[PDB]
Amino acid sequence: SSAGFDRHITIFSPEGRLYQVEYAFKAINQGGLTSVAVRGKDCAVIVTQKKVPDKLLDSSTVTHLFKITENIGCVMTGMTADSRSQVQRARYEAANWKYKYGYEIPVDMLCKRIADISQVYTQNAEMRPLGCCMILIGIDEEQGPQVYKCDPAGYYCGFKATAAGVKQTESTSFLEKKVKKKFDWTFEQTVETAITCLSTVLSIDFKPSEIEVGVVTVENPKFRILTEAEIDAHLVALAE
Amino acid sequence: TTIAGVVYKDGIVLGADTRATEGMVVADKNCSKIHFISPNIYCCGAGTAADTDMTTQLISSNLELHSLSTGRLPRVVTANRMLKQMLFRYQGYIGAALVLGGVDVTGPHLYSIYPHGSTDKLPYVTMGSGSLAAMAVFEDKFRPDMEEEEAKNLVSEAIAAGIFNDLGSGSNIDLCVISKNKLDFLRPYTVPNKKGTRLGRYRCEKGTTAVLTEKITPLE
Amino acid sequence: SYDRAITVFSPDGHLFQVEYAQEAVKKGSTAVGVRGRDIVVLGVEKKSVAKLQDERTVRKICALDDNVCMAFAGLTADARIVINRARVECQSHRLTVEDPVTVEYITRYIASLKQRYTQSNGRRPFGISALIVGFDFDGTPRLYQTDPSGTYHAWKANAIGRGAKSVREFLEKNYTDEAIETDDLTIKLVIKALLEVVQSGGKNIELAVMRRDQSLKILNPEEIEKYVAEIEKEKEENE
Amino acid sequence: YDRGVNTFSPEGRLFQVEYAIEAIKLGSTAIGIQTSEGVCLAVEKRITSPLMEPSSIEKIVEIDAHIGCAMSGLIADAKTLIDKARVETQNHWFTYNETMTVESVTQAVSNLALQFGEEDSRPFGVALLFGGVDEKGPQLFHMDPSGTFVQCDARAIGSASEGAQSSLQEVYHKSMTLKEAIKSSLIILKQVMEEKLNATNIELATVQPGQNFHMFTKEELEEVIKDI
Amino acid sequence: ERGYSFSLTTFSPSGKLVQIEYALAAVAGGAPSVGIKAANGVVLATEKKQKSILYDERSVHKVEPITKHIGLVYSGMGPDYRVLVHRARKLAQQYYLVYQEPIPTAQLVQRVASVMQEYTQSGGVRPFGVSLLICGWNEGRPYLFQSDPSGAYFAWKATAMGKNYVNGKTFLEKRYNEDLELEDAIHTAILTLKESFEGQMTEDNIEVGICNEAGFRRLTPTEVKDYLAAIA
Amino acid sequence: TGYDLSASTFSPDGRVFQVEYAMKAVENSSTAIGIRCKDGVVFGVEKLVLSKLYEEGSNKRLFNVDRHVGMAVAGLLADARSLADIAREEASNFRSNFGYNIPLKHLADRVAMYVHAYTLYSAVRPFGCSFMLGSYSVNDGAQLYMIDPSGVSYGYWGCAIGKARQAAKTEIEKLQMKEMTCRDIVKEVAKIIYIVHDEVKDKAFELELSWVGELTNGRHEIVPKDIREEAEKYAKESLK
Amino acid sequence: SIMSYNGGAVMAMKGKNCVAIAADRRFGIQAQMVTTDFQKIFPMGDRLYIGLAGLATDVQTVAQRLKFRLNLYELKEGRQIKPYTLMSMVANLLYEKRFGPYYTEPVIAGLDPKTFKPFICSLDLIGCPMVTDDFVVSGTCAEQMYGMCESLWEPNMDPDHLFETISQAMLNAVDRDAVSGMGVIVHIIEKDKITTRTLKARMD
Amino acid sequence: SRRYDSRTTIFSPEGRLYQVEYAMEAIGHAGTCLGILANDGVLLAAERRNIHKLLDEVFFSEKIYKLNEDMACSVAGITSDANVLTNELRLIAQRYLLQYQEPIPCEQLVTALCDIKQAYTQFGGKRPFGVSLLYIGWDKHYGFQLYQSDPSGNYGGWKATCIGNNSAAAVSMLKQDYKEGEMTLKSALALAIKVLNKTMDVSKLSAEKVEIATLTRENGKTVIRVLKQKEVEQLIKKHEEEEAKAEREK
């Protein structure tokens, strides 16, 4: 099935399977980060946790969440080396978009760029395939809520309930029958299920300082980085 | 060669003539200076015809691939930025006088195209050498938020006024109407200037023309 | 461009795929030549023609100038490149220094170009060799050789190709200084050489001759039977 | 284990270059001698067949006016270095108006000796014998393929190299004259030549301030042959 | 960067390219795809089914037309599909600049397969496993074309791609005879969609584009449920 | 075999050992640390002296970028000078386009782009050098950051590198991140580094100091070791 | 101007179902006679011609470069080129150099490959397209060329009166300016068959 | 990083380029072509690869492509890899027309393509061309010119050529029926028909499964003629019918 250097580079097997980027699928589990995303009717929620080695860990560098523009923001998983560079590439694509085009970005074409970028790097195996997973939200008129996730395989897909990571198989499988059905989605309802899906694998109910939770609703379209005060207000609101 | 238009309440109405000649000699009475862009946007050419046509083909090229990739109706400012960027790189080497307007979901937009690339938004713009009397009729008789029918009368009278004034304006009248639910390109409209019948018959007959060699080349 | 090592220096004293590419010349058809003060001659065999079609275009001897004759061995592709490259050289030496090309000038070009063609990476050496036969200016003759390493050396007579030691051993009769006193003796010398070299004969034999300023001529399969008649009859005359 | 062709050795040194240093041992034998009257030299043409033409094979070349050179092992690559260095000798005559010094031929050749690299191409197996006479008198110089330069009163290359120098160490002395250097060297030359001595076997290369060039001329070497 | 660009995919002892054989294996293990050129226009169906209920057909599409009068389908991976589509949109302008007129069907296949065959001899990777189906309508007679990784393209009325491409085509050989209409082409498209079904007859499990001599028409799944509900 | 050879080629575990080989190569380096109080950031390095070896003050691992920012490196010394010089001249670009101080958080992004890109390409390799980045200003504040051969941009209030690392930074938690005054924390960290990083193995060693903060008014230089001799003025009595 | 050196006037007069084109035979320098042999109209493709007026270098340059692109077009797909694509191909090459533009006055007289529809266009050196069903002319005299078309030419004309009108057109107009003369060559093409006629002027 | 390439350019221990052998196998697999003697005309014959009857075949000639108006070429090998050389040589013959404004003698044109065919061989370890094609046409000097391309760089041109392992059995028939002028275009039609009858294993020698093309010299037309299937049907039927009259020797 392997001829020469095939095992170490990217070509197609007898079945046409890639050997290198399937290692990139297990390249996400470094650090044990789990990011879940629940997009409601008028809102979209992101939830992620962190690991703290000791008290010297800085609270300013805690945030793993990234913000594309004032309207739209991102969340990354896997090795942080590929995530910080791929986010800076999203900064370059968004700044060049507003420059030459001069209007709002659908966030769909940004995910088209990153999907082709990670694919072009998957093409030639002499540069690192960049197996980091790209997850965003979106805000656009007349389309309601927008959430898009650019996978390292080179394609972009995202919807109301979508997530990627190590333990997302369990949680999202529960979110299959849990989300719909008929269930209507408010602000505190989408954030609640964002906690319950974390309570499926973990159920630690730890203080809000550990989670990194973004949320964006459409009243003022600008996304805001959350403060632990309002999450603590939602933590006592989810305890019955 | 005169292009002008006005943006009414619910849309945009533009106009142009067909006359492109040199001097007082009558050459081409029929020329189309209104060029295609996209369903929501049209374009009016002036100055150098061939250079502005290759420019509007590149702009229609960028808007064709982008709108087809996005699947949505693009904004007028998307092509305006590339229009003002390309013409600014030449600093006015290629003479470009155009009327950039269109009606999107955001409403009507109008931008004046100059060889340097300076663009400003106005309810009405006049380009070409017939922009003097057209601006005078506009500025004097224009009131904001007119309907579509009164805008057609204003454009018809303004373009027909610049005919006699300007030297190279006349022949057929072209109408350009842009709106959200409707796109109207109406050509021709009215031909005030004509040329009368011949004074006498010089019509040729056989026997006065000497032919040296007549070659026959059957086809098929 | 393309970076890679063509061949590397082995302690055995020579490269691998270059000096072993001499076998591509060793497996080629038999080719010989003889310089002379009156007429210069050469020869080639193993044409492998179908005899039912036109073989005139597979001819193994071309001319940069009427006074310059190109005799090569090995595969045809690298030979055609040697042709066109030497045509650029003979034409550049036609433009500059209008007089025709000297043998030392064309051998230096062909040999050293192939050498610098073996030097830079991403260039595979030619799998061919060649030997020049002709007449130097002011009536002097010429013959030289070419090496895959691009070294040129002048012999008294040219014996190369398949069975180079076999034909060189047959040159024992060619070592005579009387050869050739006349053009008929020169063609009779090539007749004895072509009969001995190698598999032959009667069809695949292909050669040509040039005498002084007269341009080279390729005889039809008519006089070739005459030279083969008197050469085969000479064995009956030697009894 | 072929790695990069540029890889070092654990001893160590460049792999491919040292392999070509051993490749010098199959070349022709040439022995230079430094003498106040002039720098002589000779080489064996190594006749490969009785058909060989004598003037076609020469292992000694003339770089500058008074500067000679010799070749070893592979030829055409060195022959390119010959005339390419001559361009630098003419560029030396451009600004300096005079003949290039024999010691500066080291900087004109050995500096560019191996520039080879995979990107922006392969080393050489030829060692050069630099003869000449500069403003300070006769000078005999020798360089290796790797660019390392050393001044030698007598240097042998090719096959007989180790054997010729080992035998010539005794016969050489500071008082050696020109004619003595020629007739005492051909004793070693006739020992290191396989074929019977004739005019086509060996050639002489000499450089003198008052007699030149010279080089050497034929039919005189036969007069030295009968003086064997 | 490196910039090797060497040809490393080479001839097998039999003369073929083993890597391209792996490419056609990726096409053979591809999703079921079919299209029918009959009479007025061409119909495209294939299949798209999400890995779970979390995804919808309203946003991401497996079928994106190359032009307003020219649609396209394919088999294999989507990321490389949108790559060659991106090059197809760009190449469409290189044509339109000189012509100032729309483009014939085969005119895309000539230059796309040339760049694809160039990408074989070129370094890096190859055409991969994406086998594109090009269709369109020009000169009054529409066309349906398909190429392979090696660049070999053929013309026909209808074909099956992806998995079970031989079985579905042998079923289309007996069903398709003489000429067919757009409604009949969609009908037997439901038949070849019911071959590997799975998701036939349901509007959200398939997407139906249709080419016509008036230009290509891409209908939402709503019209897919209109014609087929009620299927056949 | 040999999945670890090329940096652009993954391994069955989902990473590249070239980064891992460079990680534990930094572990052989001596002490490289940093700590930031409210008034500044303290730096120190332990020099290992094999025999003599040479004069005092030569080729110290403590380097400098701008007046407000400096380098404390680890691992290979030459490539440390390399990335030090790259970040050294990089501040001149921000100083040329703008003319004020370069933010250290976004200055580490440049080194993140350099180190990550060198892990991307198969031709080049990853650098086996890590280092510490710290600074303080009246309009900025105290920011300490840590970059390793993997190209991770992150920081702590204090951190350590070398053989003794986690054991060296443990008791540092006694020194507060804010309430402490880094002027006195000079000798406070000096007693830790003198006791930790056991010198019984190699008896010959040396200690360097530096600082940056408000007392020098945003100036990064060496707080004098010859003045007040604060290093061993205390720590000689700390181990007994 | 450079257009006053070679000069020349290409008169393409379309008939009812057919299109005709005519040009002067004389090729020379100013008023000094050289030869009448050079024809400024060249056949391109099947059932299509092109007239050219201007610098003879650019005239033959368009002849060889259009033959380049047209051969590539016909050898790729065997379909005959449409005149609209041909005009966009001519305006493309003339626009390729904005600051380097050549000097020519291309006049294309051709038929429809699919049907009997004729075609006429006259472009400037920058490739300014003009598409009409009436007539196209490019040359020296402005008053004479279009003046004879206004005084004579009609939309619906038979080939008999088409050649007679263009005759006196090339007589009462071209003979006014001395830069063109010494005979006139006429090419009239139609779906049926191709016809070629010639004329004569003074030999002084 | 030197171990990734397979050294297709670099010489092999067998004393010759090793990839050229597998290249001759690439053309020597499924490729079926031939040539006919040229007397006041010439014709071409090949095998149609398509076994599917549902195909449109609206491209007219399948395996034969027209490089010039009066000169075309047969091709055997990978389709698109040959199609790259079709437009390439078409542009080389076009830039020659762009030079002299006059057609191109095949001699220097074939040698030019041979210099292009050696590009992949002589540098970079590139994959050599897996396509070997024929040559036909007419010139002002030698009249009808029928040439042949080889992967080794030679032009193997003959007036009777062979392509493919199955066509290697026709070489004995080519020299058994060999004559010169003599042979009419009609005689070469029955000659090549019996060539396929001996070589091709298709029962009854189906006319629609094999490609046939002709060429004529007309003033100044010199038409390269693509033929309808009607005359080929009756040709092969009349051929094997003449063979039914050739078995009367018993």
Curated annotation (Swiss-Prot), chain B:
Cellular location(s): Cytoplasm; Nucleus
EC number: 3.4.25.1
Gene: PSMB7
Function: Component of the 20S core proteasome complex involved in the proteolytic degradation of most intracellular proteins. This complex plays numerous essential roles within the cell by associating with different regulatory particles. Associated with two 19S regulatory particles, forms the 26S proteasome and thus participates in the ATP-dependent degradation of ubiquitinated proteins.
Name of the featured protein: Proteasome subunit beta type-7
Catalysed reaction, written as an equation: Cleavage of peptide bonds with very broad specificity
GO MF entry, a single one: endopeptidase activity
Summary of the tissues where the protein is detected: Expressed at a low level in colonic mucosa. Up-regulated in colorectal cancer tissues.
BP-aspect Gene Ontology terms: proteasome-mediated ubiquitin-dependent protein catabolic process
Organism: Homo sapiens
Keyword Protease in annotation: yes
Curated annotation (Swiss-Prot), chain C:
Molecular-function annotations in GO: identical protein binding
Residues with PTM Phosphotyrosine: Y152
GO cellular component: cytoplasm; cytosol; extracellular exosome; nucleoplasm; nucleus; proteasome complex; proteasome core complex; proteasome core complex, alpha-subunit complex
One Pfam family it belongs to: Proteasome
Upregulating conditions: Down-regulated by the ribozyme Rz3'X. Up-regulated in colorectal cancer tissues.
Domain of life assignment: Eukaryota
Record PTM: Phosphorylation by ABL1 or ABL2 leads to an inhibition of proteasomal activity and cell cycle transition blocks.
A biological-process GO annotation: proteasome-mediated ubiquitin-dependent protein catabolic process
Protein keywords: Acetylation, Cytoplasm, Glycoprotein, Host-virus interaction, Nucleus, Phosphoprotein, Proteasome
Locations listed in the record: Cytoplasm; Nucleus
Residues the record marks as carrying a glycan: S129
N6-acetyllysine: residues bearing it: K226
PROSITE patterns to which the protein is assigned, alphabetical: PROTEASOME_ALPHA_1 (PS00388), PROTEASOME_ALPHA_2 (PS51475)
Major location (coarse): cytoplasm
Database matches in NCBIfam families: PRK03996.1
Job description of the protein: Component of the 20S core proteasome complex involved in the proteolytic degradation of most intracellular proteins. This complex plays numerous essential roles within the cell by associating with different regulatory particles. Associated with two 19S regulatory particles, forms the 26S proteasome and thus participates in the ATP-dependent degradation of ubiquitinated proteins.
Family from the record: Belongs to the peptidase T1A family.
Name of the protein described by the UniProt record: Proteasome subunit alpha type-7
Species per Swiss-Prot/TrEMBL record: Homo sapiens
Encoding gene, per UniProt annotation: PSMA7
Curated annotation (Swiss-Prot), chain E:
Record-linked Pfam families: Proteasome (PF00227), Proteasome_A_N (PF10584)
Gene Ontology annotations of biological process type: proteasome-mediated ubiquitin-dependent protein catabolic process; response to virus
Annotated effect of mutating L108V: In a colorectal cancer sample; somatic mutation
PTM comment text: Phosphorylated on tyrosine residues; which may be important for nuclear import.
Phosphotyrosine modified-residue sites: Y4, Y22, Y74, Y119
Residues modified as N6-acetyllysine: K68, K169
Gene3D superfamilies noted in UniProt: Glutamine Phosphoribosylpyrophosphate, subunit 1, domain 1 (3.60.20.10)
Keyword Cell membrane recorded: no
Main location: cytoplasm
Domain of life: Eukaryota
Annotated positions of the Phosphoserine modification: S5, S12, S14
Function: Component of the 20S core proteasome complex involved in the proteolytic degradation of most intracellular proteins. This complex plays numerous essential roles within the cell by associating with different regulatory particles. Associated with two 19S regulatory particles, forms the 26S proteasome and thus participates in the ATP-dependent degradation of ubiquitinated proteins.
Alphabetized NCBIfam families for the sequence: PRK03996.1
Quaternary state and interactors: The 26S proteasome consists of a 20S proteasome core and two 19S regulatory subunits. The 20S proteasome core is a barrel-shaped complex made of 28 subunits that are arranged in four stacked rings. The two outer rings are each formed by seven alpha subunits, and the two inner rings are formed by seven beta subunits. The proteolytic activity is exerted by three beta-subunits PSMB5, PSMB6 and PSMB7.
Family the UniProt entry places it in: Belongs to the peptidase T1A family.
Protein name as catalogued: Proteasome subunit alpha type-2
Curated annotation (Swiss-Prot), chain F:
Location within or outside the cell: Cytoplasm; Nucleus
Modified residues (Phosphoserine): S238
Pfam families hit by this protein: Proteasome, Proteasome_A_N
Family: Belongs to the peptidase T1A family.
Identification of the protein by name: Proteasome subunit alpha type-3
UniProt subunit comment: The 26S proteasome consists of a 20S proteasome core and two 19S regulatory subunits. The 20S proteasome core is a barrel-shaped complex made of 28 subunits that are arranged in four stacked rings. The two outer rings are each formed by seven alpha subunits, and the two inner rings are formed by seven beta subunits. The proteolytic activity is exerted by three beta-subunits PSMB5, PSMB6 and PSMB7. Interacts with AURKB. Interacts with CDKN1A. Interacts with MDM2 and RB1. Interacts with the C-terminus of TBXA2R isoform 2. Interacts with DNAJB2.
UniProt-listed Gene3D superfamilies: Glutamine Phosphoribosylpyrophosphate, subunit 1, domain 1
One of the GO biological process terms: proteasome-mediated ubiquitin-dependent protein catabolic process
UniProt function note: Component of the 20S core proteasome complex involved in the proteolytic degradation of most intracellular proteins. This complex plays numerous essential roles within the cell by associating with different regulatory particles. Associated with two 19S regulatory particles, forms the 26S proteasome and thus participates in the ATP-dependent degradation of ubiquitinated proteins.
Gene Ontology terms, MF aspect: ubiquitin protein ligase binding
One cellular component term from this protein's GO annotations in UniProt: cytosol
Record PTM N6-acetyllysine, positions in chain: K52, K201, K225
Organism: Homo sapiens (Human)
